[model samples]
Target chain A: GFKQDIATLRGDLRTYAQDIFLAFLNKYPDEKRNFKNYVGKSDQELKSMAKFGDHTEKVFNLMMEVADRATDCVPLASDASTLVQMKQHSGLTTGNFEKLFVALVEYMRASGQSFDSQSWDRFGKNLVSALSSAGMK
Target chain B: GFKQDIATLRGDLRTYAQDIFLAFLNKYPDEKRNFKNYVGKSDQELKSMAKFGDHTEKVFNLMMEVADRATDCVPLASDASTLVQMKQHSGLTTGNFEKLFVALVEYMRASGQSFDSQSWDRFGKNLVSALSSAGMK
Candidate 1:
């Protein structure tokens, strides 16, 4: 009987998260422009554009948080690598999760821009580094 | 600021978790009836009281989903350790994370009566044993 309570709470959180993601995209007009498929495209671009650095570490930290938190909902591994796999299916690899997060933050910084299509494409384009010999920039 | 939106969502998730947790307690009156807050209660005890498991995991997974869907949240090693720290601070060790999750779920099941808290907890506990000697029931 009490088991049903969870669904309501979980649903609220799910709704809240989705709203936040949408709001963030709206904030960063550039990113907002790219909210086409929402989770799918963003996660993919992140995988394509991953790099290693302080920023990368920040991204990794978030990823780990995601992993740990995921176990709370799903029966999954606590190890880092397995987490990566679990997330990868959702498109949250080390490579681009940061970019997406930062971009979302950037949206927060701006705060009022409406969403569009072209800008989202631009967001996707900007997500990945071309990988120059000097390194990703 | 749009950051307010994030705050709103986080608050919502927390509230959601609390509600579910409380509801479980209500449903499991006897379990709650026997509830004893002893000194030096291990992490397992707290988790058992909380009913950590699929239900707990559901809350956690919802949290991650919110983060992931809202932005490109990723996991970092440090973040994982921080979670470890939080668990330990709450009297739970790394080994206890899984146990705690299952305990919460068991508690939920037992309280609901419709679900089987004892069996659920025992099964998960045994599964942990079967997989590895670590995180025993």
Candidate 2:
């Protein structure tokens, strides 16, 4: 049933990813200018952009991978690397990444998805650690 | 991501099902008599009962199927027939069914799985309607 529960939401990952980013923007209203080119665009349009699409897809896909293997840290570590790359390329700080990460998890929770708390905690910590290793934090 | 979420939790369905029943018992403590045979047993023992497993599997599987199709009702109708049989055999009332249904849904939500709300509402309504058609309220 967990598989079924997840399967039901699988199709919505893209949408959830988009919403997470949007929520991030809403939370840090001033940060909207960080991706200023996406400002005023629809979720659909924003996601379609190669720059946006490329980064989010990696982050979201990694999240999906890690969630699927909830007990494993391998995927989580790989995902952290992706986040580090995004931070480096986008000049987004560790705080920005953490906020975005929280928004994504909250979005999933608000949308009625269940997550293993310990697993989520590990994931968050791993990402921040990765950011710190990359000298961002 | 929904797929990943579900996939992660699939391993816990049997446990989740047991917890759902346990929570239901806890909520309506008076209703514990309904499964008096399971009263003193651990969760594992209770779920291993032929009666508990049979009914829970049907309901849980229906939920999974409905979730997969996302918009279809054929599965819901089929699931209703199973519930109707349960009703006729167990002397369960619509109110009882509603409580059990809510518990199951809540269990999923608490477990960190995201569900499509509209789909879930429709699935619930369809089940209730099916129960009504089978001459129970």
Best by lDDT: 2
Could you give candidate 1's per-residue lDDT for residues A65-130 as a string of tens digits?
A: 332343222312333334344433343333443455455445433545443323333333333321
DockQ for candidate 1, C-alpha atoms: 0.04
**What are the DockQ scores of the candidates, in order?**
0.04, 0.02
Top-scoring candidate (TM-score): 2
Question: Top DockQ: which candidate number?
Answer: 1
Question: How would the docking of model 2 be graded?
Answer: incorrect
